[PDB]
Symmetry: C2
Amino acid sequence: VEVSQFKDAMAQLASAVHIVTTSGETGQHGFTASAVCSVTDSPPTLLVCINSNARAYEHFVKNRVLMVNTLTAEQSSLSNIFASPLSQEERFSNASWTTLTTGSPMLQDALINFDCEITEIKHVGTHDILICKIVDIHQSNAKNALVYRNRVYHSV
Amino acid sequence: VEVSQFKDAMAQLASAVHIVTTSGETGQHGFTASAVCSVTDSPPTLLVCINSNARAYEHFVKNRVLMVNTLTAEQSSLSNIFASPLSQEERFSNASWTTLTTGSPMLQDALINFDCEITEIKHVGTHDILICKIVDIHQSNAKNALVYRNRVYHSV
């Protein structure tokens, strides 16, 4: 199918919004993602799709850990910031961060935080699939989720 | 992490809802899925996670094509029907279906329809990842999406 048609069809597919981070000597690194889903509960595992040409990519390959920080309805600016060509220092300055187990930065006031080991990497052309065993979780209660659909944000 | 904690954390992660189908001599087969996301646009590709122990599974392995039918806000009963131990005949009787290119059943009145070839299969324990090249698309306009979060349905 044509790429434009696929992009317009994908614009219809509602998705949760996450900021996926990792830790480095280069310091903190992260990116906004929608292509995240659970895989299995034996053991709890999720996947994250990543552009293998992105600035982000080799930090994830090198470290082999990541945090999935699922965003609340109040964090749409942060979503945009982590999707845009800003330095990591500027990006991270816009929220508060800690760590769980891996050292990957945990976003404070997030909807959910899944700290993961990148167990394996599969190549799918311009993107890779990161298979991620979950090793620590923090969850919120009574918060609303950020959702992206029709190229705008929503509260669910 | 504990499975119960992971399930409760996943309950917070908003997701689109899809009915994933394929075609057979055994006839039509399908299942409700949330673990679906785009992968790449070179060429347009999505993935679908499937329980390799499910009744559904070997039909997908045998046929090597599937349709992702993304649901509208009006199709929550259909979502439940395709998640429950009903015969495929009973399931399919509850909507209208056609075909695009692969013969996988296309759900009428869906939000989006992605007809796919299952290019490769990766094993991740109890689940597999189906890598799916998109070969035909139908999209709706001006409809609302079904979203699942906190174990209940939503309109986005």
